[PDB]
Amino acid sequence: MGAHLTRRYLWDASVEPDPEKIPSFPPDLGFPERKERVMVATQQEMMDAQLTLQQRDYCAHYLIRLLKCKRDSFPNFLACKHEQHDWDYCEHLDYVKRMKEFERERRLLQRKKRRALKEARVA
Amino acid sequence: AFCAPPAYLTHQQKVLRLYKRALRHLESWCIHRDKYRYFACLMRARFEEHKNEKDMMRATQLLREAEEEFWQNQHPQPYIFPDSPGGTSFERYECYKVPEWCLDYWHPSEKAMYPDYFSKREQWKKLRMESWDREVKQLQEETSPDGIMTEALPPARREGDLPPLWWHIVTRPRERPT
Amino acid sequence: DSWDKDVYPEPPSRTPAPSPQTSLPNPITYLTKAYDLVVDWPVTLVREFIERQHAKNRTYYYHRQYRRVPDITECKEGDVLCIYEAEMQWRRDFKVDQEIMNIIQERLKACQQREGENYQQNCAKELEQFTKVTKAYQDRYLDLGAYYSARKCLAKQKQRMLEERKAARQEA
Amino acid sequence: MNIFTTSILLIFILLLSPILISMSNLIKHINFPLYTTTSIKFSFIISLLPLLMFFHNNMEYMITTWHWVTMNSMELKMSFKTDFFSILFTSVALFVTWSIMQFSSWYMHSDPNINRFIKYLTLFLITMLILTSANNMFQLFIGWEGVGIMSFLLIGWWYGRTDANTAALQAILYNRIGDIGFILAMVWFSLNMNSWELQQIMFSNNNDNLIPLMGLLIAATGKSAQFGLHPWLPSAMEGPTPVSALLHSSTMVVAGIFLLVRFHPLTTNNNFILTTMLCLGALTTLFTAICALTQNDIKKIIAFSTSSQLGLMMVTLGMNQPHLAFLHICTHAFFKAMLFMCSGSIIHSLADEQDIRKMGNITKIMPFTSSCLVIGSLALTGMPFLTGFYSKDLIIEAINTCNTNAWALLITLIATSMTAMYSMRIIYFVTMTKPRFPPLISINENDPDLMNPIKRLAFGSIFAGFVISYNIPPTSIPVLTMPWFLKTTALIISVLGFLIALELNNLTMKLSMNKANPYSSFSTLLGFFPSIIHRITPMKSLNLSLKTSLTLLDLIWLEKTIPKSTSTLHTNMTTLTTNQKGLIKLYFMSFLINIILIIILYSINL
Amino acid sequence: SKYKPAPLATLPSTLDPAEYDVSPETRRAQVERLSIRARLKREYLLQYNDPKRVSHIEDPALIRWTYARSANIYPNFRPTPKNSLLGAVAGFGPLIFWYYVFKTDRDRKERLIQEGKLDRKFNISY
Amino acid sequence: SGYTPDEKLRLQQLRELRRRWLKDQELSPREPVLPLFAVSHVLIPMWFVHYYVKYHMATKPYTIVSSKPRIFPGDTILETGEVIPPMRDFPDQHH
Amino acid sequence: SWDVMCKHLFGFVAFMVFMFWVGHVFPSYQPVGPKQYPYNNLYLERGGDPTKEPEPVVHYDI
């Protein structure tokens, strides 16, 4: 639930993004040589830690840590707490990214609407 | 369940049997007690007035509009007692009410124990066969002149005779077999 | 004689070593130490005593080997004798070619329990074979009725050997 | 680690042990209720040993105990899986069972057949666990049908009562409609990919898998009382209250949710079915919850809540979040089991009054159950830091954060407020009100057999969410980042749900007539699905057999055509050929005709 | 809203005009019918409550029911319309419906198999 | 209404008989004339199971299969002796 | 009354089914872009063909 929906459903959706196609514009657009994401873990490390495919995120690396401290420290299930904060953070710091990307695509779409009209000089 | 159904219903029993359904369907709406006891002495008022209407036609016109007022102002889940037809325990314990003519096929070993029980049971069975004749004859000698016939059965009317067709109102499987 | 490590393979085992990082005492290690004494030792003792009772009068059982008779492909028409011997030789291989497919049904099942969350990948040595074996079983034994006979596999094949000869000729 | 395998096989052997003791003459001599209660107790401890193993190391085991038939290509074998779903559930189920059998001994005391009742309860547990740990689906079917039949035997414990018999036939009919779905899925997996073993079915990920999973969804809707055929679980309450707690409350209903989690590797591939159950789970959640608001039967309200919570469980499976759905199944079992047996205590202590209308002020008369009831009520309403809270709000915020039907998202949240409302309805009417029960009072809950189990589950209801959430393997990668109103939505809606309901309960006490809204009766008679779809279908399905298929096409049309007609054709033919004058002239002439025709037959064919 | 009896959810006893009738003729039946029942009741109640009886009380009203329902049907059959039209739509209607349901499917399947599209993968059984 | 004076006697009398029937139903004294173990069913069943699981199942092929054990970075493999390489260093310390 | 029942029940059913449709038309989705999986959307691990490399799908920071 939220206003974002109201923008798209109520009013007009022209400038509202379509969730199905979030990186709708050129990936490089707006960034000279933007750096791609980086993964600490290894395609194998994960495969050896039997991480569920879904859980193989860019935070897979802090997960493996948690899982390590959960097998070790077995009888004590309440002590791998720092490890969970870390994983979560990594992920919060990923959700935010996925939010920054969405906002960037929003704004860029607006650029198009602004520019079209601007570029749509009368004559 | 005990007494027999009358053929037609009077005006009264129809009115006085609404006073029950009504008040009892007012205690589903008034879940509390003080609210109920209040909202109900107000009900009687409704029945209390229009008590002395002598104009039958009218009376049967207040009754027929009462039972429609009621049908549309009834509670879907009335508070029906636990052990009454439509209830929650209705006929629950019937799986344990065996019909007592079954202790007659028991193996002489089984009936060997429980000895005095069958000593008294054989007395009662002597009572039953000892009167079937005087009973059926009574039932017949007292067949009122052919005409209206209701399911009411006669009392004894003589010493030693056992009030008739009694073997199954007495000797009824006990309610809670448990 | 429990199983041929090669017909029912089984991968070597790799186990992470114990690395406790807690003062508390593991509730599993203690129990096992008991199971091993009150459940295993008692049983272990009995079992051995079984096998020595066996080894005294050790007996043997062989595996009938069936000589190969002539197949329907070569068998006179109407000669009920030869064809009878040759429909059996096939109905026999209809089963030997079926427990093979039972093993691939099984070998796989294990390879997806032993490699969970990786089954998508690690276990593709067998699923490639489950099609290399299923595409074949489908090509000799499938359309046939419940009256499966060697004459009909002979025809199911030979209806298609036209196709591997009409299609080929067609490609020209 | 044989300790693991042996343990999984052993629980079944230990639980089967009460069953054959009753087959032999030995049970008359020992006490069956006490003996059965102890062995489930030992089974729970035996179940704990694998549970620690899994947690220590997170490893599974497929155990193929016995081969049943080679059947050529499709070999059939008896296999128990020990995946996280199976052993976690096995432990939770036996704890609930250990609680109920002790409750059963107190509840059915004075029943002349206590031993048979305990016997069927464990047989139910054996089928339920087989349903839980079943590798090939043929065994899953043995469990699916098996709990259905014993539910039929146990809902209608008191066979004499026709109401119990009607409910039992209801339950079998709804389950069998579900069985058609499982058979369809079984047959599709018996063709296409070929084996009923889960370990191979999961290789059908990149196939169509819609014909089959739609079948399992149909099976789940019948077993889990989704909006389609939702009524038998309310009807199932005609069973003894302990039966209602262990099977109507936990093991039997969650079976539908459990089946889909088993097959969710396939479910993730098909987007179409995921929203289908998200949608129907959502409709059942509110539909059942709204019905619960006006129901005046204590057991009925709890049962509707059983359906509403599973509706939420269906929703999480629909949003493709299988692990958390399983987490709610375990937490759901502890508190719902408590509330039922809590009402078991109230109903038995009172003169078998099963109506909230005549039951009041149990809080002062019976603090022990009232304390247990509110602990359970708050867990049901997801009170913070209680077992419901650890799993339930994860599901709520999951909804608030995923891409979903707007109608589904709104109904699920108000469904959560209603759960608080009906929860409020129970404690206000049952506990906090002036007493309205019959005047003689004879209440005793001191019996150890009442308290102990209620006490033991209460400890589980208080601490289980804490223990299960930390111990389970990290899964699902939850989204903890939310605008604060969505992060706290579950908490607030639950709070005002009670707040609004408390306003309502308070309103009634006044001397002013409110009665109820026009849609209130619609709510009280279960949405009218029972009044209409139970009188038309059974009427137009039986009328057609007797009147049309049996008497019209059978009997007359299929007897007048083939058997009777041939009777008549001849009868008539003999009547003409044998009605002869007997006079010689006539007969002889006929000889004349014959000579003539034969003369010709030769002539023309010369 | 007036209750509206349907073939189901019938008009209750109350709310039923007939119930509210005292026309002496009606009361006449209502008291004549009890007699039939009372009579039948006092013919069940001193034959079931009879000592010295082992034979099976018969309940001939149930024997008149079964005979009426499985052995008095064809002796009261007269082939009309609304009976033979409806006696052919029931026997051949669906039986012809499913034939074009199964033929069309079986034919679709066969074509696809012939042309080479049906996957028939991992299907090693039938 | 009120009971008919001849029905308050057929209920008068038949109730009197029901009271005697229920008295007769009462059983006389003597009426019924009749003419740690925990380890037992936890240990005895266990030995058998183990006998079965360690000498049939274990012996037969693919009867008890287990997900691979989990191996994380930096933890040693007992059977082979290898030490799983430590992973690439986590650069961030942001909490 | 029976009619009242049949109409009401089915009305509810329809309104619901419909509203669910209004829903699918206008869904609820947070302001979050798409999740990003490493490698080539786990091409090989999703069981992709080892030999044939996939068109690299790259995900950049911010």
Ligand SMILES: CCCCCCCCCCCCCCCCCC(=O)OC[C@H](COP(=O)(O)OCCN)OC(=O)CCCCCCCCCCCCCCCCC
């Ligand atoms: C034959 C043609 C038809 C004839 C019909 C009438 C025949 C009557 C006269 C002959 C009777 C005996 C012959 C038929 C029975 C044969 C019994 C038998 O064959 O036992 C074999 C069984 C070992 O099984 P086996 O298949 O060798 O091992 C599996 C290998 N993969 O050995 C055993 O396991 C014996 C076990 C005895 C006790 C078994 C009890 C198991 C109960 C399991 C089911 C429980 C639930 C059942 C639900 C039913 C619901 C209706």
Ligand SMILES: CCCCCCCCCCCCCCCCCC(=O)OC[C@H](COP(=O)(O)OCCN)OC(=O)CCCCCCCCCCCCCCCCC
């Ligand atoms: C009771 C539960 C009912 C559950 C129903 C579940 C239905 C699932 C969908 C089935 C119908 C769509 C199947 C789609 C498959 C892929 C598309 C296709 O090509 O269909 C296969 C084939 C051809 O169908 P179609 O494309 O419609 O071509 C007709 C040309 N004249 O299909 C055909 O062979 C032609 C016929 C297709 C439609 C058949 C409809 C069957 C209706 C069953 C009624 C069941 C109740 C009957 C009465 C019971 C009580 C007495």
